[PDB]
Each structure stands twice: as structure tokens, then as C-alpha cells.
Amino acid sequence: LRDVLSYHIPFLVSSIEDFKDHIPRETDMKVAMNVYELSSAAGLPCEIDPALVVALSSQKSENISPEEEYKIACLLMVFVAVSLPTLASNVMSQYSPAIEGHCNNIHCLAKAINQIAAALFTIHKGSIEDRLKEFLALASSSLLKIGQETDKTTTRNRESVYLLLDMIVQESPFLTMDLLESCFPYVLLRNAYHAVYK
Amino acid sequence: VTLEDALSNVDLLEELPIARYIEQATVHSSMNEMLEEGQEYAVMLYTWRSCSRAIPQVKCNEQPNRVEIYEKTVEVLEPEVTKLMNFMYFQRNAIERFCGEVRRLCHAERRKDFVSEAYLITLGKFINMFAVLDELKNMKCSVKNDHSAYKRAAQFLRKMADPQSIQESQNLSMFLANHNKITQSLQQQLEVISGYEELLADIVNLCVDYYENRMYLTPSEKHMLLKVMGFGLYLMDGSVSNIYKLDAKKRINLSKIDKYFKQLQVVPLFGDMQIELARYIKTSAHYEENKSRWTCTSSPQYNICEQMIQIREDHMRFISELARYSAQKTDAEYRKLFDLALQGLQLLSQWSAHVMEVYSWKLVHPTDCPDSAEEYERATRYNYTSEEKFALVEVIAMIKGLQVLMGRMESVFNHAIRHTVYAALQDFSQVTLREPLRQAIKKKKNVIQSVLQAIRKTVCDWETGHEPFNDPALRGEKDPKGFDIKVPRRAVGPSSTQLYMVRTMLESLIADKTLRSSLEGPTILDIEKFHRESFFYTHLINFSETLQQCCDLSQLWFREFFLELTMGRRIQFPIEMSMPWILTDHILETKEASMMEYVLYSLDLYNDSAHYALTRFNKQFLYDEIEAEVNLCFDQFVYKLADQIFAYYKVMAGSLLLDKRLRSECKNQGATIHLPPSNRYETLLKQRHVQLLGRSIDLNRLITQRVSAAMYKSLELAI
Amino acid sequence: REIHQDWANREYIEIITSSIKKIADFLNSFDMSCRSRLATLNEKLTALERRIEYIEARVTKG
Amino acid sequence: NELECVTNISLANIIRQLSSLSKYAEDIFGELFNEAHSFSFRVNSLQERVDRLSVSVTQLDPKEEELSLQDITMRKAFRSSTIQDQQLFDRKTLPIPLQETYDVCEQLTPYR
Amino acid sequence: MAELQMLLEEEIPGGRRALFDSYTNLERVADYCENNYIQSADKQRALEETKAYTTQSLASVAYLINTLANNVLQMLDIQASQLRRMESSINHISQTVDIHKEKVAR
Amino acid sequence: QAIKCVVVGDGAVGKTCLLISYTTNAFSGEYIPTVFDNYSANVMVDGKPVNLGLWDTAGLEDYDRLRPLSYPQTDVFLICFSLVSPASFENVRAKWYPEVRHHCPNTPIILVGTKLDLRDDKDTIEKLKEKKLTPITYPQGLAMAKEIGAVKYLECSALTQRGLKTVFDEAIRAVLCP
Ligand SMILES: Nc1nc2c(ncn2[C@@H]2O[C@H](COP(=O)(O)OP(=O)(O)OP(=O)(O)O)[C@@H](O)[C@H]2O)c(=O)[nH]1
Ligand SMILES: [Mg+2]
């Protein structure tokens, strides 16, 4: 949509780009959401998707309270991170250069985690950078653990999960390569890339 | 103003976004100072270049500038004869001292007295220094020609020369004339002494034990042991001593040496030169009639391709174990850091040894490629395959990746190492030595008393500043049942003098009635356990120096030895035959995605070579040559990288925009369009810290300029 | 005894040397970080300089 | 005691190392300041250019626009700057610390 | 704006001058303490004096480094802010030019 | 691997210019007499690396007390005579054959001429004719070399370096192969 609209209504697209890019950070969330919704309608790549936030905000039940919902959201990332190493035993998790991903579509978990975390923690006001940092730290520790042993069946595709961590850091804007280097050397990722390419 | 206040200011920066061993100790130091001077004379010879070519030539006797061309040659090559005088004087004195030391130590007292282990290693390094210097003098040729030109010029000018000057000049010419003069002089002065073969056997036996038990941490020491063993064997053969008779007497085992030579055949002496360990055996006097005993001469395991699986597995497991270790802890944690640091250094040394040994073997074994080519071309360029080059750069990248990690943890490593050594030494001295002291006190063992007291007085630390007076061991009576003593805890390592003295005393207790016959089982078992565990304490204390020395790969560029063999028709080899460029060029031309990210690790080798030359060689023309080579090498690398990046992206866009139905129909017909293989230029593009020759280079800017020009050209072509 | 005094003095040296090493390590890291920030700043500056030149040429008359 | 003298020598060496560290920091700060000062001049010059352009562009009169003939190509086609940096590792562009490491080490045509 | 030129030509040159003065002081004090220890009859007092001097030097050096690093970071941040403001003005000018051109084409 | 070569002959026959040209690729005319000199080279012959130590001996009558010590522990002997000097040619028969053989009887001997470029020069041969001397020719050397039992007879010219690579190449072939 962005490519199509670029050569159709350049004036409106240019005004939107300037409006979004130069929006002050100190502004409230309501105005920012309005800008993102308009930006999304224009096809721009907003970091936070207003549509996801709106869809996720329509939920309620008997035992729902703000404090327990926040705890559930925080615990969801921990569960995902601890479950990530289990993919190493999957045969269909073989990364291939011809696909730049995996046959089981596990390379899209990076954007799924980022979008889900951003929407959940902007609804509940919780910080995003700190939460993502904790998720990366837990994932890095677990990924190092699984690679420590030498079981053939359990670690058949350990390289594939390593590339997933690299994808998570790259796609995530709140996460920088400096944090990954502190918690995960880039040497392992380099070796994984060589092994799969072979 | 105070240590605590200064530490707080520093912390703010971090948040920002017996007289018998005294006599031997003095002798050991004297030999060490001589070895350093010998390496300086060895470096002077290796960095020697023909200065006579620049001197103008005279074709007729009527030249107005004949006298002046001779003045010139003399000034220029005067500073070079003076150092030759010093070198000849140094080697003459060094041989005299070595022979005298052997004369002192070969007396009948040897049958009773034992000799230290560090001393024997020093002697081995001494003879190795003689061997390398002899090779440098023998192989070098420009030295003799330069001296001859200077002598002729002086004679023509008659620089008012006197009787002693001509005698010295004639002596130097003969000294450089004689083949293997150093070896012949040493052997002649050593054959007179009777029993020198026994001391040589002890040195060889010590080297075998060290090599077998992995008693080393740096590749240089590993190669030194083999060189010492080979040189010692060559010296043993002669008109007085025979190795075969000694072997039949069980004094020396030759099977172990043969197996080691078979496994490893080539070691580097100094610089690009190499020595075949089997050469010493070939030159043995008694080798002709007993050549069947040695099987290492006949020539299978240097294929680095098949040795990469273990390297990758070892690299991954160590990194995984280490990455989790990125306000006081238990001694177990410090011990784990001690073990991890030792394992990392050992792994780095093993990788470095593999790379260097493969390079040395390939150089010694040239191939038999066009009809016309230089020896360097045949030795390096055409002896390497694509798989071989990829493996070498992979090992180099792993070495550097682990090196940077260890350097970052240097602070934590240093604290753990210092804490562990202090605790182990104090606990051993204050507890493990109580029982032997009690036994010696109970039954008069004055000899044991002196050594134990010296060990417990040189390094022991007392919390109260004095030795307790209630110790049962001192009084000689058996201890109750505990008399527990709380040793102090701190992070500081023993001094070099203290560590050497305690080790010598500790290892003097254990020797081959003897002084070891009055000790029980458990007492010794701890003694040797500490003896074999404290060797690396000094190495680990200076972690930074050990790490850089272990990860040194500055010998992959120097080629002075091959330049001399070109008969002076070459100033320096072209960039095509240097190893770092070959590896980089091969990666770029092949455009292999797997090895794309390893190119940078193959280009910073120039930094290591430049640092080694400046720090050790103390020469400048080598640095200038490095900069000139890098100047064009980087430009070629940038040009190729930009061109392939632009082509790869352009084809990707074209294929991505192409219709899929047409592609499927073409594939069914039999005219499928092959897709473009993916690459990994992502890391290269984002790089902005290409450090080379102490300079920061923005690779992104250069790639942007090339791509911008290419895009403009394409648009103009389209129109 | 002199031995205890030597141990204390050497401990003083060890902590001081460690402090010196920490300062040097931070100094190197700070130099690298500032240079990277400096490099990216230059990249934007040159891009702006090119863009303004293009705008001036587009609008200049004669 | 010789131990006291050895310690004092160690303290003197520590002072020397601290002084060396001070120099290793002074050169870095000086180099960065000199480089950043150049960027300040470049930014200031660009600011003046933009201000002039803004004043010029806010004065355009639409009636003043004129178009040339369709068959006129005499206008000088605009060309963008294409300066590609090269010979990067040159002796002149060497860091002062390398200079001290250089000069410290060791260092006939008319009659040929 | 004024604070910029203030730290350009008042802060960094002063720090470099302080660093040079510190270097000379470090060399002079080390020589004095060593000469005092050899000459002084009492050695413990000399040992304490040099310990105080080295601690003072270390604290001063760390303080100088911290202020210089903070000043450099502050200077870089304001430069980046100026650049971002410049980019917005350029974009507005470019947008103004392109609408002006379309009106002439229409 | 290492071959020791000593060159002997009459004075002013071209042994220094010969060795200097081989090692440094330069020539000269000045005559600086030589009590002793040393030169070295590293060349590959028959596909193997060979180190060539070269020893220069004075031929002047007076300096006969430093010549004998260069003889022992040698591999090959080089005898050089000037093609434009019959006196040097006969000295090989009168001497330099017994002198080398007496000190080293079982060592191979290489005999090669010198000053080949001057053999065809008319000016030099004419002046030799005023002395009633005639230059040596190729067959004469063949007979002399056969008489003294040398391996080969070759000819050289340092100025033109026409046959100066061959003489050293064949000298190594004389010791390493047989
Ligand atoms: N034309 C010509 N002249 C030569 C040649 N070789 C030497 N000469 C000249 O001969 C002179 C003396 O000959 P040398 O080569 O010095 O003789 P040498 O063998 O060293 O004998 P000594 O007289 O004992 O020193 C030189 O100064 C040259 O001028 C040659 O190949 N051609
Ligand atoms: Mg001569």
C-alpha cells in the first residue's frame, strides 16, 4: 500500500511522514495513537500497531484486574522464552539459505513477540524496553544451556534457534546489538550461519 | 587522597553510558640476560638488507668521484661492522661461559647433587639460541658481500688502518667463512669434558616429560622442546659419546622422539625460516649404519579440513560454558575461573599451533602452476586449496573472537587467579607442611628441618604478625585428637623470587641415601601435586602478556628469508603472493556466503604484524612496507565488495519483481531460471570500526559512494 | 614482621594497578563509542549537505 | 630493608604508568575535540545557507516563472559530487601515538 | 547556543592544559618522593607520603576524565539536536518547492 | 646442501670481478689487490636448494702464507686463467695443480678461462703481439683440462656474463650428483 500510494498522492504521504517523524516524544499516548492509526492507514511501518491494541483491549472476565493482567503479560514472555529451546529437537526447523528462514515458520516469532509485547505493555502502561531486555536475557541463558550438551536428537537444529535470537534482536527496535553481545556473543551466530550455509 | 576515595572516583567513570639456592638463583639470572642479548643479535641478522647495491659502481680508474664513492661506502657501512664485532665477541664469550658452567656441573659431585628443572630449561634455550644463530649466519649471504665491499673500500682509501685492524678483519671473514662455526666450536670445547652426555641426556629426558605431560602453555615452548631434543641428540654423537649405546643403557629413549618427529616434522626457528627436526638425525655421525632404527625420516595428517569438527565442537562448548560468567564469592567460584582461564589459553595455543605448523609444513614442501614462478609462489599460493584457505581463516576468526572475550574478562580473571593462588599457597604451607614438620621434629632430620622452615618462613603470612606458640608440631609432641588456624584471605599473588625459591625447595625434597627416603606416602603425594599445579601460576598472573603471546600470528607476512634467495632481484614480493590478501581475495572472488563475515578477521593480521615489528624488531622499513601494502589492499577490497553488493541486490530485485507464472512455465518446459544464492553482506555494511594501522575507516561511506555512482550510471544507461 | 608488611604493601600495589587498568579499559571503550556516534553524525551531515545543494540547484535561476 | 625500597620503586612505576595513561587520554580527547570543532564549523555554514535559501524561497513570485523552448538542451546538466576517498593508509594521516612509536625506532644518486 | 561556544573554547582546552600540568606534577612528585625516601632517615613516613601522593594523583586523573567525557557527550548531543532541527527545515523547504513547481505545471 | 668453493690462480685473472658479478650483478675495472675475501650465494641447481660459500685467494707471490689454510675441508676447486695471458696458462701446469692436489688430492678440479670478451678484440691482441704473445683458443684449454684431469673446461666473461652462471652451476653438479 505504501509503494502504491507513494506515486499516487505524494503530497499527502510527505505531510504524513513529516508529521509522524517529528512528533515530540513527550506528547501523550492518545495523540500518538491517533497519528499511528493515520500512519497505518497510509501504509507506513509504525512501531506500535493501533489495530492490535484495539483488538486486545476488548477483553474482560470475572477474575480480571489490572494487576493480574499485567502479571500474566509479564509471565507470557517468560513462558515463551523457556519454551524456545524445545524447537531444537524439531526436524522441520532446518534453516535453509534458499528461504532465509525455516520450513516451520518460526522466524516470524520475532515480530510476533515484539508486536504482542508492545501492545500489551502500552495498554497497561508498563515499560517495553525493560521487559524485552529481561526476555532476551532469559532466552540467551537458556539457549546457552541447550548448546552446552551434545545430545544428537535434542540439539539437531541448535543453529536454527540461534538465528531466531539474532532475528529477534534485529527486528526489535527497542533491542540493540549491544545488549545481545553482553548476554550472547556474536561468534556463536557467525558459526551457526556458516554451518547452515555449508 | 585515600584509596577508597580514589576508587569511588574511578567507579563513577564505569557507570557512564638458605644460601645454596640464592647462589643458584644468581647463576640462573646471568644466563637469562645473555639469552635476551642473543635474541637481539638474532633479530639484527634477520632484518639485514643488502646496502651495497645502492653504492655507486666504478667502471674506470679515471673517475673524478672514485675517492668520494669510497668515502661514501665507508660511512654508510661503518655502523654495520661495529655490530658484527660485538656479535662475534658476544658468541665467543657465551660459548666460554656455557662450557665453563658445564665443566662446573659435570664434576663427580653430579653423581650426588641434583640439578634444578628451570635451569635445565634455560640451558635448552641456550643451545637453541646457538642453533638459530648458526642458521641465521649460514643462510644469510648479504652480510658477507657487504663486509667484503667495506673491506675493499677501506683498502683503497687506506683509511690509515693498523696491524690489529687487519688481523681482526681477517678473523671476522674467516669466522663468517666457516660453515657451522658456532656448532663446531661448541662441540670441540664440550667434547673435552667427560660425562657431558649425561647432562645432555637429562635435558632431553626433561623435554620428553614436559612434552608428554602437556607441560606447556605457548606454541613457542612446544616447538622449543623439540628443537632442544634434536640439537641435544646431534651434540651427543661424536668421538666420545654414542646415542645408541646410551639408548641400550636405558638412559635415553629414542622411540618417543621418533614418534614426536613423525607427528610434527617442521618447527619455526625465527621468522619465515623453518627447520626439519629430522635434519639433526640425518647429520648424526653414526646414522649411516643404523638408519633402520629411526622411521621419522620417511614421509599425511596435516589436512586441516578433517580436523575442524573437533575445533568447532570445542569452541562452542567453551563459549557456552563461559558466556554465563559475564560482594564476595566462595573459593569454588574463583577456582572455576582459574580452570576456565587455563582451558581457554590452552585451546588458543592449540589452534595457533595448528595454523603455524600447517603453514611451516607447506612452506618446506613446495609443489611442482605455470612453468615460470618464484619459490614463494610455489610454496604458498599453489600449495593451498580453497577448502584449506577457508579453514585457516575460520581458525583465525575463532582465535580472535576468543581473544577479545578473554581480554574483556581480564579484570575478573586477574582477581580470581590472585585469590586462588594466595589461598592454595598459604593453606599448603600452613597446614599440609605441619605433618612433615612433626615427623622431622620427632626424629632428627636437620636437613628436612632447614628446607621446611625456609618454605614456611619465605611466603607464609600470619594474621597476628607472629607464629603461634601453641603449635604441637613445633614442640614435636602429637597434636590433640584440633588447633584450627584461620588463614588470611586476599587477592595478591606470590612474587617471582618467592615462587621460584619455594618451588625449588619443594622439588628438592623430592629427588633421586636420598632425602626422599625419609618421607611417607601422603606427604609426597601432596608435594608433587602442588609442584605440577603451580607451574602456570606465574603465567596466569600476567594474563594480558600470556594471552597476546599465545594468540600471536605476526609470522605470516615476513618473507626476508625468501627475498635473500631471490639473489637480490626483488625489493619486496607483490601483494598477490602475501597470505592475508590471498585469503581475502579468494573469499571475495568465490563470493561464498558462509565465509563472507570472516574477511575482516583476515585483514587485521597487518595490525598484529606491525605491532610485532615495532615492539620486537625495532625496524621501520617493515612498517612502511605494511602501510604501502594495506593502502592498495583496502582499496581493492572496497572496490570488489561494492561491485558484488550492487550486483547481488540488483539481481535480487529483478528476480523478485519477475512474474511467477512465467517462471513455473519455463521450469516445466526445461528452461528454468536459477535463483540468486543469498549472501551475508548485512554485517559488512553496518561496520564502522575498521581499525587498521591505528586508523578508523568508515566502510559504509565508501560503499555508499560506489553504490551512488553505480545507481547514477544505471539510470543514465536506461534513459 | 617484614613479610606481613610486604604483603600489605603489595596488596596496595595490586589494587592501584587494577584501578589503572579499569580506567584504561573505560577510556578505550569511550573512544570507540564516541567515534561511532561521530561517524553516524557525519553520515547525516553529508547527506544534508548534498540535499541542500540539490535544492539550491533546483531553485536557482540563471 | 630491600623490600621497602622495592615497594617505593613500584610506587614510582605506578606514577609513571598513571602519567602514561593521562597522555593516552589527552590525545584522544584532543583529537575528538578538533574533529568535532570542524563539524561545528560545517554545521554553522550549512545553517547560514539554509537561512538564505528560506528567505529566497519565501519570495518566489509565481508570475515570474518562464519556460524555455522545447528544443533547447544547452542548459548545463546538473552533476552530483562523486568524490571517492582513497589512499587511506598514508604516512601523513598517522595518529600522533604512532609517530612516537615511529621515530623512537631505528631509521648516493649523484655518484651513481 | 551560548553554552555551545562556551564549552568549545573554555572547557576542552582547559582540560588539556590541566592534563599537561598533571603530567609534569606526576613526574616531579615521583622524583621528589624517591629522593626523599633515600635521603630521609625514617622510611615509613616516606612510604606513607608517596602513598598519599599517588592516591591524590589517581583521584585527580579520574576526576579529569569524568568531566571531559561528560562535556564531550553534552557537546555531541547538542550537535545532534541541531542536525535534527536542520533536517526538518530542509524537508519543509523541499515540500514548499515541489508544490510551487506543480502549480506552475498546472 | 652446503658446498665450499675456493678459487685460485695467477694475479689479475678476474676472480674478484667474477665473484662480485655473480653475487651482486655488477662489474668494475679498479684493481684493488686481494689478501682474502668471502662471498656467498643461494641458488637452486637440479631442483634442490644449495648454499654456495665462495672463498677468494690472493695469487700474488708474497701472500703465500694465508693460501694453504683455505684448502682443507673443501668440496670443489676452481682454477681461473686469463685467456689473454699465456703466463697464467702455463702456471696451471707448473703450479695450482700440484698445490691443490698435494693439500687435497681427491677433490675435483674445475678449470675455466677468463676475459672471453677480450679474445676477439683486436687492440688487446695486437699489444700482446708487440710482446710476441698470442691469445689462447678453445682447443688448447681442452688439452690442458684433460691433462690435469679436471671435470670440464669452460669460458667466462664477467663484463658480458655470457658463461658465468654455467661455471657455478656445473661446479655444484660436480659434487652433489657424483
Ligand atoms: N675486460 C675485463 N677486465 C676484467 C675482467 N675481470 C677482471 N677484469 C679486470 O682485471 C682487474 C684485476 O683482476 P681481478 O679480478 O681483480 O683479479 P683477482 O682474481 O682478484 O686477482 P688478484 O690480482 O690476486 O687480486 C680488475 O680490476 C678489472 O679491471 C673481465 O671479465 N673483463
Ligand atoms: Mg683480488
Numbering used by the authors:
A (entry chain B): 924 to 1121
B (entry chain A): 5 to 21, 56 to 337, 341 to 367, 380 to 421, 428 to 540, 542 to 572, 578 to 784
C (entry chain D): 10 to 71
D (entry chain C): 24 to 130, 137 to 141
E (entry chain E): 1 to 106
F (entry chain G): 2 to 179
Mind quoting what the paper says about this structure?
The Rho-family GTPase Rac1 activates the WAVE regulatory complex (WRC) to drive Arp2/3 complex-mediated actin polymerization in many essential processes. The WASP-family member WAVE exists exclusively in a 400-kDa, hetero-pentameric assembly named the WAVE Regulatory Complex (WRC). The studied complex is composed of a trimer formed by WAVE1, Abi2, and HSPC300, and a dimer formed by Sra1 and Nap1 subunits. Rac1 binds to WRC at two distinct sites—the A and D sites.
When the A site is occupied by Rac1, we noticed that the A site, the meander region, and the WCA helices have undergone significant local conformational changes. By contrast, in WRCAD-Rac1, the density for the W and C helices and part of the meander region were not observed in the reconstructed map, suggesting that upon Rac1 binding to the A site, these sequences were destabilized and released from the WRC. Distinct from the D site, which is flat, relatively small, and largely hydrophobic, the A site is concave, nearly two times larger (~1138 Å2) than the D site, and mostly positively charged. Given the low affinity, it is surprising that A site Rac1 binding is mediated by numerous, mostly polar interactions, including 17 hydrogen bonds, 3 salt bridges, and several hydrophobic interactions (p for more details). Among them, the interactions clustered around Sra1R190 seem to play a particularly important role. Sra1R190, which is strictly conserved in almost all organisms, is anchored within an acidic pocket on the Rac1 surface formed partially by the Switch I loop. By comparing the WRCD-Rac1 with WRCAD-Rac1 structure, we find that the conformation of the A site in WRCD-Rac1 is not compatible with Rac1 binding. To accommodate Rac1 binding, the A site must undergo a major conformational change, which involves flattening the concave binding surface by ~8°. Another major conformational change occurring simultaneously when Rac1 binds to the A site is the release of the C-terminal half of the meander sequence in WAVE1 (after Q130, except part of the α4 which is accounted for by a poorly defined density in WRCAD-Rac1), together with the W and C helices (dark magenta vs. light pink). The release of W and C helices explains why WRCAD-Rac1 is basally activated.
